[PDB]
Paper text:
MPER bnAbs show outstanding breadth, neutralizing up to >98% primary isolates, but have uncommon features. Notably, long heavy complementarity-determining region (CDR) H3 loops with aromatic residues at the tip facilitate bnAb binding to the hydrophobic MPER and nearby membrane. DNA sequencing revealed PGZL1 was from subclass IgG1, whereas most MPER bnAbs are IgG3s. Using X-ray crystallography and cryo-EM, we determined the orientation, angle of approach, and composition of the PGZL1-Env interaction.
We reverted the V-region of PGZL1 to the most homologous germline alleles, i.e., VH1-69*06, VK3-20*01, while leaving the CDR3s unchanged, thus creating PGZL1 gVmDmJ; in a second antibody PGZL1 gVgDgJ, putative reversions were also made to DH3-10*01 and JH3*01. The MPER671-683-bound (2.47 Å) and -unbound (2.6 Å) structures of inferred germline PGZL1 gVmDmJ notably differ in the conformation of their CDRs L1, L3, and H3. When superimposed, residues in CDRL3 in the unbound structure are shifted up to 6.8 Å from those in the bound complex. This shift of CDRL3 in the bound structure may arise from MPER binding, which cause a rearrangement in the aromatic interaction between Y32 (CDRL1) and Y91 (CDRL3). We note that Y32 has affinity matured in PGZL1 to alanine, which does not affect Y91’s orientation; thus, the CDRL3 and L1 conformations are similar in both unbound and bound PGZL1, and resemble the bound form of the inferred germline PGZL1 Fab. Using biolayer interferometry (BLI), PGZL1, PGZL1_gVmDmJ, and PGZL1_gVgDgJ bound with affinities (KD) ranging from 9.9 nM to 64.4 nM and 938 nM, respectively, mostly due to different off-rates. Hence, PGZL1 gVgDgJ binds to Env when detergent-extracted from membrane, but not on the cell surface, whereas PGZL1 gVmDmJ binds both solubilized and cell surface Env. Strikingly, PGZL1 gVmDmJ neutralized 12% of isolates at 50 μg/ml and 28% of viruses at 200 μg/ml in a dose-dependent manner.
Numbering used by the authors:
A (entry chain M): 5 to 64
B (entry chain L): 2 to 27, 27A, 28 to 213
C (entry chain H): 1 to 52, 52A, 53 to 82, 82A, 82B, 82C, 83 to 100, 100A, ...
Amino acid sequence: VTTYKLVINGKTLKGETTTKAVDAETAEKAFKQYANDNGVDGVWTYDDATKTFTVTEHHH
Amino acid sequence: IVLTQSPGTLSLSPGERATLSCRASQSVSSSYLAWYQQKPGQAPRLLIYGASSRATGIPDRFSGSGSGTDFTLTISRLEPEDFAVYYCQQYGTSQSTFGQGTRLEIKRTVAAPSVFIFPPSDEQLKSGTASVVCLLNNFYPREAKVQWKVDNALQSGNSQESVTEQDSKDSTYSLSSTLTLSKADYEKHKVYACEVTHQGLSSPVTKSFNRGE
Amino acid sequence: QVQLVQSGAEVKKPGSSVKVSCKASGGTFSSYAISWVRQAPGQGLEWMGGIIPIFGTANYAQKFQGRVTITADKSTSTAYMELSSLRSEDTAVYYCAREGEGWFGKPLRAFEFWGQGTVITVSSASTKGPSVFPLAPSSSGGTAALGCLVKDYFPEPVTVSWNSGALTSGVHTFPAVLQSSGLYSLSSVVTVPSSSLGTQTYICNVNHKPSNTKVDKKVEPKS
């Protein structure tokens, strides 16, 4: 319906994944679960122009 | 018709002669019996058609024979690329059946596995599940038994395992087993052990760890 | 030359139906049977049915009479198979195979040409990117083992490499396992010298195209 992207900037886990949601809030809820499932804890940013969330752990 | 192949697994060394058998419950006309070769991840490949004719491009060390209910595929000198699964087939317009397949595997000396055990990572425990992984590396033959123990209590129904194909370099197998528990159940026990039985071990081997240490 | 190209992998909900296509190029598409043969994971070949396009007459295995329809389109030299009210036991690779021709006199009565296969997964699960967990080397005679646990993804497949493909010796990537959740799970391990754990970086590169997951997990020794 609209594809959103997650870029992961963790200490040991780096890369990207996507999801299909209607809302940015529905994608955020999918991405925050995924990031926790992979034990990533970091700072969240969002760019609506590109439908891209970013999570960045402190240091790397 | 029921086509029955034998043996189910055939363990031979390269250079040896392989004999594969396809037996039918009832008579099959010779021009309807075909043999196929299948390798992991690939489509089947026609070897023999009409019981005895080689398809285009099949080396002449493959031969087929038989009539009635007894058919045979012979490979006179096994080259390494010949180790695969083989299917006979009764070709038909209105009905067609396949044998259940013979796996032709490389025979080598007995090799005992190296056994490693891995506790669940810290990042997995953040998500409420705990996976314990036991690795059996480079053993032969393929038959191996893995028992999980949690505080010396035999586990059951909470593990899955899978085996690699036979390695092309050294002809061994590897096995991975995963024991799965909730995070809560994992925190309630201390000793996680994996006991391995195999032909190259004179007695079961146990690898283990204590949660926390 | 004769070539059978099949449509792509599909995930289907139970009870639905799927149509698989097989386009033939480089031979006559008329007087030679096109059959469909399926193979469930870890199991044998099972003939489903076939059609001679020029006659239009389709035959089916008893097992599938009533929910499979095999048709042929001579206008595009494409053969189709439709399988309805899918169940989990219909998860398999579906091959199209075409009878070969004789030298001058004909029918080979064997499948000379095969398609590359179509993976049909029948599941109520949704697309889910993998979680990648380290299998950390501990502190096996001078040899350490490490790896990655690629857990809870759907559908198949995932590909795993190590250090962007520069590490290949000692690597074992195991066939995925289907969990009671409906999600798949697999492990990739590598065997390395214990002495290298302090100086080499080991990164497993996990790719899951259905979720467009490309993800790199650094596996470090636990102290």
